[PDB]
């Protein structure tokens, strides 16, 4: 990846749905006045949402709304990760690979995708709907080599049932973003019971 | 390790190995050397005037030892002694030939000597 | 050579790859060492007699 | 420490998990006595936590009890806020997001009951947007209560009540420091400031803020609701309380459990539930911290209780409150590089020691593992790690070397023989 | 679960019920 | 520090403190400053009056011989307001030492 | 009446309540080496080439931005400080490619008049060196960004004095460039004046580009008349 734009969509053009100009009333409402000047983190991302990846005319647009010189935007979109500057697919999938996720062999829930899905890492599927990456520090390491799709996460996975989670998704079916097997909440099991109680008859530190 | 008449080598297919970094000029005790660079057409830099006076040069071995790109080299031939002081001053395009007349002499000395220094 | 390399140049293997070996070969062939102030004298036995430097 | 435990009863600091997720009257535990607390003078709450004296869950020392009764004693011209990390930076932490997922009703109270001590004005939280689903629901949890009139602007019974404004990040480590979060709450790029401006309670949004953590403001109401004399239960005269551990990477059923201090790792790892790898003969090479502590071998760790200062007795302590271990097949040298390959991607990059100083290691760590050019390097690579300490602004550097600093400690030969394994191979 | 549609979440109950803000100025 | 750094020697620096202490003692009409060069040599700052006088004391004595005159020289410094300088330099054959005698001046 | 006494290297000196170490330790005639600090601009902390060593405390502070309290003993020269200033300026020579024959600042640069006097001796790396790519701004500023010790002294200057806000910092980790994200050329008055700022040879002047090194010239003071202020 490179962080310079070869004049793709200087005028794409792009604009916000008039249903969205009534929320930006609420966002700025959060902050104090005169310092407002950056709501950019939601406002720039909401724009990703309306589109699904933001071209360079998206980066220039919000400046006209927020009156900041639009190198005080192109910067912020090149720092964080979640934003996607280049185009993407219909599903942008993550394989957590880190010390804990390595110990439970995240490579299991990783490759055997190339033999199933039939594409390399970091490359979108030849059409659209699929691409592949990996990231670090999200959610739980208490689960198996958990996997993220787009807005959800599939905890406690295995090579056997993830064959489905993709393949049932290719059909258009969405299989329950939770730790499908084992314990549903990631329970202690070993003192899970506890018998919840009211707080021991309060009136305690009334003094 | 002998010292004597000067040269300017060039690599295989020739680059005029000198980059005009203005050093063999600035360590020179006698101040013989004179160098004027100016950017060559492509944009790689080279020289224009390079003149070793052959009367002032005191034969140090300070201009063989400061050149990082390893161009300028004291030859081992005592061919000298012409009859007019209008002459011994050298230009650039006297040197190169005088250093392409024998490179079978030079290119086989350094590879004896360069392992010591 | 003396080892400490502020007063000695480096070889032609070293000045030609790593970094630190220019800035002490390229400031060592314009200005010199930095040798502290204060006066000396010295002497030797040269074949015909002594030799000074003050 | 008493009986060398750390037990778990139904008497704990967390109310419920599988019982009731949605809103209500806080059917039993929560939202119990309020108007009596807030109506009494604010500094009554201040120092009333000292009966516990929570060290804090932010991965460090510095008991939470001091900094709130610390400066922000007075007030002059400019409002005070609350910024409470919800974020997780450390690999394998996972302690967070379980608090929020099934029981949000606690923390909105935790601020309101907590924020009164600060004398603060508004309430910000912060969450890595990488959690889209669970974090999305807090707003409901806010609404499902706040809409009933439980919070703001007088609610309830006082003249002081104020709401909580969620926000989100993207590729953050930013919770990796305070004095970064309060910067990227603003919308700059996030390069954490210098630590002593005016430390984090003077230079702030426009005006003084305090950066708390999750279970530092979560358990405060219930420890001011009852307290005691049970506030100090387990742990020695120094560290006291019961925090959460979340086991990961080899076990029978890695899962959270509430466990009090001074618990030895040899019964704790085996329990909750099993040890499923070899309880022994699996060599039990262990990491006390999540990423912030180096290895321990089979030595006194297993009898070493999890009390903080008990760990400073060993070569490293851990405030992160997480556990990752190993048994046999995992090659540590192979399994520590992808802890370092992580650091290289999460660093700001201002400072000259951090940037350009971590890669010098990360570029060489792929020599050892692969196996490759000769020793005497190890002796240098130690000095590099010894050379980044006071030299970086944030802790990410001070949290950069320890894994490598403490790998060269505790395992000499595993490297020495591998450099041979490729040496003999070359031959 | 709702991939787009942060709207009413942001603009329905929040929009009317986030008072005032005063927030001051900061003109600058 | 040892390998490349010139090893010092103290004994030579103790005595040439003493023996030069007291030639500010017995000719105070003349000598206006004295010191010890870190390499164990002495510099006696002397008014221009004594030149023939001081040497003559250094010329013979049983505690300071200094028979061998080695090097006379000069230095010329602007912005010293008295331009030039002399430096006499004398070796005492019995006692193995060098003691230099600095005397300023002008042109006129 | 409103001043502090603080001992620099065992010598007392007076300082107004709220001058930093560096403005004190200048009063007695020393330069803590400098990279990101500069008078006329603002101050940030990202060089880490001034580490003074305070007396009786295990940490080592930084003498750019931090006040000076009732008298410390500000110890410049010891075996502790000299353990740092040697250990930073071997880092920022990790990537600094092998120019100086031809880097047109090659006679003044500050990877040169520091790193002989202060700091290291030889190098241990041994392989590496990212090389990024340049671009252009205008027909004055010539830009090779392969160098960039990244003081960020060209950036705090745009948003500062000459009010044109353009230049930026794009990236994360070992890789961040400086020059502008889009293709905008950056042109104004006083913004041909950058090329005093940048301490190494990243930004060097166009018309002068290659003509002479700066040990040969002759500085004869003068006055410029095209206009009022002279
Ligand atoms: C790499 C890194 C990641 C961090 N991640 C978090 C985090 O996810 N959540 C958090 O509260 N603090 C995190 N911190 C530490 C912050 O300093 C901490 O939140 C802050 O000091 C608040 O502490 P307190 O509220 O317990 O007093 C992180 C620090 C580092 C270096
Ligand atoms: S040879 Fe070395 S010194 Fe002589 S010009 Fe070419 S580069 Fe400069
Ligand atoms: S030969 Fe001796 S004198 Fe002639 S230039 Fe080289 S060094 Fe100076
Ligand atoms: S370490 Fe240096 S660079 Fe990495 S984040 Fe902390 S400060 Fe920014
Ligand atoms: S630019 Fe600065 S550092 Fe790079 S070579 Fe020329 S002088 Fe040495
Ligand atoms: S120009 Fe060179 S030095 Fe000046 S800022 Fe950009 S990179 Fe850093
Ligand atoms: S870091 Fe891999 S899942 Fe938490
Ligand atoms: S000089 Fe120290 S911060 Fe730049």
Whether residue G174 and residue D344 make contact (CB cut-off 8 A), yes or no, is yes
CA gyration radius, chain D: 23
Resolution of the experimental model, in Å, one decimal = 4.6
Let me know: does G131 contact G97? Beta carbons within 8 Å.
yes
Q: Which residue's alpha carbon is nearest to atom 2 within ligand 6?
A: G148
H-helix or E-strand spanning residue A169 = helix A159-170
DSSP per-residue string spanning D108-157: HHHHHHHHHHHT---EEEE--TT--HHHHHHHHHHHHHHTTTSSSBSTTT
Cα–Cα distance between G19 and G40 in angstroms, integer?
15
The CATH class of the D242-326 domain is alpha beta
Is D195's C-beta closer than 6 angstroms to any atom of ligand 4?
no
Whether residue D169 and residue A39 make contact (CB cut-off 8 A), yes or no, is no
Nearest-atom number in ligand 4 for the CA of D191 is 8
Q: How far is C38 from chain G (nearest CA, A)?
A: 20
Q: Which residues of G touch B26 (CB under 8 A)?
A: 215
Question: Angle at which helices A40-51 and A71-79 pack, to 10 degrees?
Answer: 70
The H-assigned helical ranges of G60-142 are 81-88
Let me know: does G78 contact G34? Beta carbons within 8 Å.
no
Cα–Cα distance between D75 and A185 in angstroms, integer?
44
- What is residue A32's DSSP assignment? P
Q: Which long-range contacts (CB under 8 A, 24 or more apart) does A174-177 make?
A: A177/A149, A177/A152, A177/A153, A177/D133
Whether residue G122 and residue C10 make contact (CB cut-off 8 A), yes or no, is yes
Q: How far is B53 from chain G (nearest CA, A)?
A: 20
The structure tokens 């220039």 sit at: A60
Taking residue A88's Cβ as centre, other Cβ atoms within 10 Å add up to 15
Say if D48-226 and D332-426 have the same CATH topology. Answer: no
Count, residues in chain B = 117
What is the sign, positive or negative, of the torsion defined by CA atoms of B23, B26, B29, B35?
positive
- What is residue D367's DSSP assignment? H
If you count residue pairs, one on A and one on E, with CB atoms under 8 Å apart, how many are there?
52
Cα–Cα distance between D213 and D324 in angstroms, integer?
22
Let me know: does G8 contact G20? Beta carbons within 8 Å.
no
Q: Do chains D and B touch (3 or more CB pairs under 8 A)?
A: no
Phi and psi, residue A103, nearest 5°: -65, -35
Cα–Cα distance between D393 and C44 in angstroms, integer?
57
DSSP per-residue string spanning B7-76: EE---SS---S----S-TTTT-SS----EEE---TTS---EEEE---TTT----SSSSSS-TT--EEE-S
Whether residue B37 and residue G102 make contact (CB cut-off 8 A), yes or no, is no
Q: Which residue's alpha carbon is nearest to atom 3 within ligand 7?
A: A141
3-state helix/strand/coil string of chain F: CCCCCCCCCCHHHHHHHHHHHCCCCCCCCCEEEEEEECCCEEEEEECCCCCHHHHHHHHCCCCCCCCEECCCEEEECCCCCCCEEEEEEEECCCCCCEEEEEEECCCC
Cα–Cα distance between A155 and A149 in angstroms, integer?
11
Q: How far is G116 from chain C (nearest CA, A)?
A: 6
Question: Among F38, F39, F43, F98, which would you mutate to test the C interface (most chain C Cβ atoms within 10 Å of its Cβ)?
Answer: F39
Taking residue D411's Cβ as centre, other Cβ atoms within 10 Å add up to 16
Ramachandran region, residue D376 (left: φ > 0; alpha: ψ -120 to 50; beta: rest): left
Mutate to test the pocket of ligand 1, among D61, D65, D129, D176 (most ligand atoms within 8 A of CB): D176
Cα–Cα distance between D413 and G117 in angstroms, integer?
40
Q: How many H helices and E strands in chain G?
A: 3, 8
DSSP per-residue string spanning D222-273: HHHHT-TTSSS-SS-SSS--EEEEEEESSSSS--EEEEESS-BHHHHHH-SS
Nearest-atom number in ligand 8 for the CA of G45 is 3
G24: its two tokens? 């004190």
Question: Among E3, E8, E9, which would you mutate to test the D interface (most chain D Cβ atoms within 10 Å of its Cβ)?
Answer: E9
Let me know: does G204 contact G104? Beta carbons within 8 Å.
yes
Q: Are strands F84-91 and F98-104 parallel, antiparallel or unpaired?
A: antiparallel
Q: How far is C45 from chain B (nearest CA, A)?
A: 26
User: G172 burial class (0-12, 13-18, 19+ CB within 10 angstroms)?
Assistant: buried
Cα distance between the two ends of chain G: 41
3-state SS assignment for residue D286: strand
Which residues on neighbouring strands pair with residue D217, listed in sequence order?
A: none
CB-nearest to D255 from A138, A187, A197 is: A187
Pocket of ligand 2 (CB under 6 A): B 18-24, 67, 69, 71-72
Cα–Cα distance between D334 and F98 in angstroms, integer?
69
CATH node for B5-116: 3.30.70.3270
Which residues on neighbouring strands pair with residue G53, listed in sequence order?
A: G75
Cα–Cα distance between G201 and F56 in angstroms, integer?
64
Extract the annotated binding site of B for [4Fe-4S] cluster.
18, 21, 24, 28, 57, 60, 63, 67
3-state SS assignment for residue G179: coil
Is D350's C-beta closer than 6 angstroms to any atom of ligand 4?
yes
Q: How far is CA D208 from the centre of its chain?
A: 23
- Contact status of B58 with chain G (Cβ, < 8 Å): no
H-helix or E-strand spanning residue G142 = strand G141-143
Let me know: does A152 contact A116? Beta carbons within 8 Å.
no
With b meaning 16 or more CB within 10 Å and e meaning fewer, what string describes D228-266?
Answer: eeebbbbbbeebbbbbbbbbbbbbbbbbbbbbbbbbbbb
Superfamily classification of domain D48-226: NADH-ubiquinone oxidoreductase 51kDa subunit (3.40.50.11540)
Widest pairwise Cα distance in chain F: 52
Domain ranges for chain D, please list them. 48-226, 242-326, 332-426
CB-nearest to F37 from C3, C38, C52 is: C38
Cα–Cα distance between C33 and C27 in angstroms, integer?
9
Cα–Cα distance between E24 and A34 in angstroms, integer?
7
D67: its two tokens? 């900094």
Cα–Cα distance between D176 and G104 in angstroms, integer?
41
User: B79 burial class (0-12, 13-18, 19+ CB within 10 angstroms)?
Assistant: exposed
Domain ranges for chain B, please list them. 5-116
3-state SS assignment for residue G175: strand
Q: Which long-range contacts (CB under 8 A, 24 or more apart) does A64-73 make?
A: A65/A24, A66/A37, A66/A38, A66/A39, A66/A40, A67/A37, A68/A37, A68/A38, A68/A40, A69/G165, A69/G166, A71/G165, A71/G166, A71/G167, A71/G168, A71/G180, A71/G181, A71/G182, A72/G165, A72/G168, A73/A40, A73/A44
3-state SS assignment for residue C53: strand
User: D107 burial class (0-12, 13-18, 19+ CB within 10 angstroms)?
Assistant: buried
CB-nearest to D355 from G44, G49, G174 is: G174
Cα distance between the two ends of chain F: 50
G41: its two tokens? 């601009």
CA separation, residue G206 to residues A67, B22, G137, G185, G226 (Å)? 34, 20, 11, 15, 22
Whether residue D339 and residue A99 make contact (CB cut-off 8 A), yes or no, is yes
D391: its two tokens? 């030299």
CA of B57 to the centre of ligand 3 (A): 5
Cα–Cα distance between F8 and A178 in angstroms, integer?
77
All partners of chain E with 3 or more CB pairs under 8 angstroms: A, D
Chain C residue with minimum CA distance to F39: C40
Ramachandran region, residue B55 (left: φ > 0; alpha: ψ -120 to 50; beta: rest): alpha
Is D195 among the annotated ligand-binding positions? yes
G43: its two tokens? 């101050």
Query: Which residues are CB-neighbours of G59 under 8 A, at least 6 positions away?
Result: D390
CA of G78 to the centre of ligand 8 (A): 21
Cα–Cα distance between D220 and D227 in angstroms, integer?
9
Cα–Cα distance between D246 and D269 in angstroms, integer?
10
Taking residue D314's Cβ as centre, other Cβ atoms within 10 Å add up to 18
CA of D196 to the centre of ligand 8 (A): 15
In chain C, which ranges are E strands? 42-46, 49-53
CB-nearest to A75 from G135, G169, G183 is: G169
CB-nearest to D391 from G44, G48, G92 is: G48
Angle at the Cα of B44 from the Cα atoms of B39 and B46, rounded to 5 degrees? 60
Is D88's C-beta closer than 6 angstroms to any atom of ligand 1?
yes
Widest pairwise Cα distance in chain G: 58
Query: Which residues are CB-neighbours of A158 under 8 A, at least 6 positions away?
Result: A108, A109, A144, A181
CA proximity to G47, closest of G91, G16, G99:
G91
F101: its two tokens? 């005698």
Is D49 among the annotated ligand-binding positions? no
Whether residue B114 and residue C12 make contact (CB cut-off 8 A), yes or no, is yes
Cα–Cα distance between A21 and G113 in angstroms, integer?
57
Q: How was this structure determined?
A: cryo-EM
Cα–Cα distance between G107 and F25 in angstroms, integer?
53
Is A186 among the annotated ligand-binding positions? no
Taking residue D412's Cβ as centre, other Cβ atoms within 10 Å add up to 10
Let me know: does D355 contact D314? Beta carbons within 8 Å.
no
CA of B95 to the centre of ligand 3 (A): 14
Query: Which residues are CB-neighbours of D315 under 8 A, at least 6 positions away?
Result: D294, D296, D406, D409, D410
The structure tokens 């003396």 sit at: C2
- Contact status of G226 with chain B (Cβ, < 8 Å): no
Cα–Cα distance between B47 and G152 in angstroms, integer?
36
Ramachandran region, residue E26 (left: φ > 0; alpha: ψ -120 to 50; beta: rest): left
- What is residue G13's DSSP assignment? E
Widest pairwise Cα distance in chain E: 41
Cα–Cα distance between G100 and B44 in angstroms, integer?
15
CA gyration radius, chain E: 14
Taking residue D43's Cβ as centre, other Cβ atoms within 10 Å add up to 12
CA proximity to A148, closest of D174, D134, D140:
D134
Cα–Cα distance between G96 and B77 in angstroms, integer?
41
The structure tokens 């009494």 sit at: D40
Taking residue G217's Cβ as centre, other Cβ atoms within 10 Å add up to 9
User: A170 burial class (0-12, 13-18, 19+ CB within 10 angstroms)?
Assistant: exposed
Let me know: does D364 contact G100? Beta carbons within 8 Å.
no
Query: Which residues are CB-neighbours of A204 under 8 A, at least 6 positions away?
Result: D225, D226, D227, D228
3-state helix/strand/coil string of B83-115: CCCCCCCCCHHHHHHHHHCCCCCHHHCHHHHCC
Extract the annotated binding site of G.
36, 47, 50, 64, 96, 100, 103, 109, 148, 151, 154, 198
Whether residue A26 and residue E15 make contact (CB cut-off 8 A), yes or no, is yes
CB-nearest to G121 from C5, C22, C30 is: C5
Angle at the Cα of D419 from the Cα atoms of D415 and D425, rounded to 5 degrees? 145
Ramachandran region, residue C45 (left: φ > 0; alpha: ψ -120 to 50; beta: rest): beta
Is D82's C-beta closer than 6 angstroms to any atom of ligand 4?
no
CA gyration radius, chain A: 22
Whether residue E23 and residue A33 make contact (CB cut-off 8 A), yes or no, is yes
CATH node for D332-426: 1.20.1440.230
What is the sign, positive or negative, of the torsion defined by CA atoms of D247, D248, D251, D256?
positive
Cα–Cα distance between D119 and D38 in angstroms, integer?
11
Let me know: does D224 contact A206? Beta carbons within 8 Å.
no
What is the signed CA dihedral for G93, G99, G105, G107, rounded to 10 degrees?
80
Q: Which residue's alpha carbon is nearest to atom 6 within ligand 2?
A: B18
């Amino acid at each position: 990846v490179h962080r310079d734009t070869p004049e793709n969509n200087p005028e794409t053009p792009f604009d916000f749905t008039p249903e969205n100009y009534k929320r930006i009333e609420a966002i700025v409402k959060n902050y104090p006045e005169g310092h407002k000047a950056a709501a950019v983190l939601p406002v720039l991302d909401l724009a990703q949402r309306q589109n699904g990846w933001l071209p360079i005319s998206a980066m220039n647009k919000v400046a006209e709304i927020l009156q900041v010189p639009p190198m005080r935007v192109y910067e912020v979109a090149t720092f964080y990760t979640m934003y996607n500057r280049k185009p993407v697919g219909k599903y942008h999938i993550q394989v957590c690979t880190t010390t804990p996720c390595m110990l439970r062999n995240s490579d299991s829930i990783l490759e055997a995708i190339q033999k199933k899905l039939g594409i390399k890492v970091g490359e979108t599927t030849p059409d659209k709907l699929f691409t592949l990456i990996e990231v670090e520090c999200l959610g739980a390491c208490v689960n198996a080599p958990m996997v993220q799709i787009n807005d959800n996460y599939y905890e406690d996975l295995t090579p056997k049932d993830i064959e489905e989670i993709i393949d049932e998704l290719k059909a258009g079916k969405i299989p329950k973003p939770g730790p499908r097997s084992g314990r549903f909440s990631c329970e202690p099991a070993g003192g899970l019971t506890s018998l919840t109680e009211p707080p021991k008859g309060p009136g305690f530190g009334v003094q | 390790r002998f010292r004597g008449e000067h040269a300017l080598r060039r690599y295989p297919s020739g680059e005029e190995r000198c980059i005009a970094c203005k050093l063999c000029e600035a360590v020179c005790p006698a101040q013989a050397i004179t160098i004027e660079a100016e950017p060559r057409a492509d944009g790689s830099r080279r020289t224009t005037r390079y003149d070793i006076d052959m009367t002032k040069c005191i034969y140090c071995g300070f201009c063989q030892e400061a050149c990082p790109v390893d161009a300028i080299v004291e030859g081992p031939n005592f061919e000298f002694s012409t009859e007019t002081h209008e002459e011994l001053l050298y230009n650039k395009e006297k040197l190169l030939n005088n250093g392409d007349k024998w490179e079978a002499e030079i290119a086989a000395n350094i590879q004896a000597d360069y392992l010591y220094r | 050579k003396v080892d400490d390399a502020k007063v000695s140049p480096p070889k032609r293997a070293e000045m030609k790859t790593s970094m630190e070996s220019l800035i002490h070969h390229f400031k060592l062939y314009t200005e010199g060492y930095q040798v502290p102030p204060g006066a000396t004298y010295t002497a030797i036995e040269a074949p015909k007699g002594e030799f000074g430097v003050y | 420490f008493g009986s060398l435990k750390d037990e778990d009863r139904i008497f704990t600091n967390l109310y419920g998990r599988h019982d009731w997720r949605l809103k209500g009257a806080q059917s039993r535990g929560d939202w119990y006595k309020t108007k009596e607390i807030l109506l009494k003078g604010p500094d009554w709450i201040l120092g009333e936590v000292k009966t516990s004296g929570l060290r804090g869950r932010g991965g460090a020392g510095f008991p939470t009890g001091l900094k709130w009764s610390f400066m922000n004693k007075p007030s002059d011209g400019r409002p005070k806020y609350l910024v409470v990390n919800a974020d997780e930076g450390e690999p394998g932490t996972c302690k967070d997001r379980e608090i929020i997922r099934h029981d949000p009703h606690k923390l909105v109270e935790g601020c309101l009951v907590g924020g009164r001590a600060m004398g603060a004005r508004a309430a910000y939280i912060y969450i890595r947007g990488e959690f889209y689903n669970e974090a999305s629901n807090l707003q409901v949890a806010i609404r499902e209560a706040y809409e009933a009139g439980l919070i703001g602007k007088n609610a309830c019974g006082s003249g002081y009540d104020f709401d909580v404004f969620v926000v989100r990040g993207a590729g953050a480590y930013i919770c990796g420091e305070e004095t970064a979060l309060i910067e990227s709450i603003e919308g700059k790029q996030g390069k954490p400031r210098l630590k002593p401006p005016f430390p984090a309670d003077v230079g702030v949004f426009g005006c003084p803020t305090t950066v708390a953590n999750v279970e530092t403001v979560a358990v405060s109401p219930t420890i001011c609701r009852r307290g005691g004399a049970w506030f100090a239960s387990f742990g020695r005269e120094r560290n006291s309380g019961t925090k959460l551990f979340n086991i990961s990477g080899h076990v029978n059923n890695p899962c959270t459990v509430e466990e009090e201090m001074s618990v030895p790792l040899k019964e704790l790892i085996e329990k909750h539930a099993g040890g499923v790898t070899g309880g022994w003969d699996n060599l039990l090479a262990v990491i006390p911290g999540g990423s912030s502590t180096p290895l321990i071998p089979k030595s006194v760790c297993e009898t070493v209780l999890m009390d903080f200062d008990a760990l400073i007795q060993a070569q490293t302590g851990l405030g992160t409150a997480a556990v990752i271990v190993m048994d046999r097949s995992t090659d540590i040298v192979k399994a520590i590089a992808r802890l370092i390959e992580f650091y290289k991607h999460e660093s700001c990059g201002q400072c000259t020691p951090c940037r350009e100083g971590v890669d010098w290691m990360n570029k060489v760590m792929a020599r050892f593992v692969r196996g490759d050019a000769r020793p005497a390097e190890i002796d240098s690579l130690w000095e590099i790690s010894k050379q980044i300490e006071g030299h970086t602004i944030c802790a990410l550097g001070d949290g950069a070397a320890w894994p490598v600093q403490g790998l060269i400690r505790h395992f000499r030969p595993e490297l020495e023989e591998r450099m041979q394994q490729f040496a003999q191979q070359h031959q | 679960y709702s991939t787009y549609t942060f709207l009413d979440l942001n603009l329905d109950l929040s929009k009317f019920r986030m008072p005032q803000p005063s927030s001051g100025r900061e003109s600058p | 520090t040892r390998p490349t750094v010139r090893p010092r020697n103290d004994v030579a620096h103790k005595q040439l403190s003493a023996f030069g202490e007291y030639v500010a003692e017995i000719l105070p009409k003349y000598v206006q400053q004295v010191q010890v060069s870190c390499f164990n040599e002495l510099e006696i700052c002397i008014h221009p009056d004594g030149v023939i006088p001081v040497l003559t004391f250094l010329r013979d004595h049983s505690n300071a011989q200094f028979k061998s005159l080695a090097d006379l020289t000069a230095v010329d410094i602007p912005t010293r307001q008295n331009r030039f300088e002399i430096v006499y330099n004398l070796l005492s054959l019995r006692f193995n030492s060098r003691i230099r005698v600095k005397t300023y001046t002008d042109e006129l | 009446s409103n001043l502090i006494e603080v001992f620099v290297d065992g010598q007392s000196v007076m300082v107004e309540p709220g001058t930093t170490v560096l403005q004190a330790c200048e009063k007695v005639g020393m330069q803590i080496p400098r990279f990101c600090y500069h008078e006329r601009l603002s101050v940030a902390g990202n060089c880490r080439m001034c580490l003074v060593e305070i007396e009786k405390a295990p940490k080592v502070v930084a003498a750019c931005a931090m006040p000076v309290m009732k008298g410390w003993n500000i110890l410049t020269n010891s075996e502790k400080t000299k353990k740092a200033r040697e250990g930073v300026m071997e880092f920022l020579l990790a990537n600094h490619p092998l120019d100086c024959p031809i880097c047109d600042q090659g006679g003044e640069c500050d990877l040169q008049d520091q790193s002989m006097m202060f700091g290291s001796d030889r190098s241990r790396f041994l392989e590496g060196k990212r090389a990024v790519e340049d671009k252009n701004i205008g027909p004055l500023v010539k830009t090779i960004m392969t160098r960039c010790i990244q003081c960020t002294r060209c950036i705090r200057f745009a948003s500062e004095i000459a009010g044109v806000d353009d230049l930026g910092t794009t990236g994360r980790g070992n890789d961040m460039q400086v020059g502008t994200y889009i293709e905008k050329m950056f042109m104004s008055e006083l913004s041909g004046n950058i090329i005093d700022i940048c301490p190494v040879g990243a930004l060097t002047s166009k018309p002068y580009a290659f003509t002479a090194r700066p040990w040969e010239t002759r500085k004869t003071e003068s006055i410029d008349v095209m206009d009022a202020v002279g």
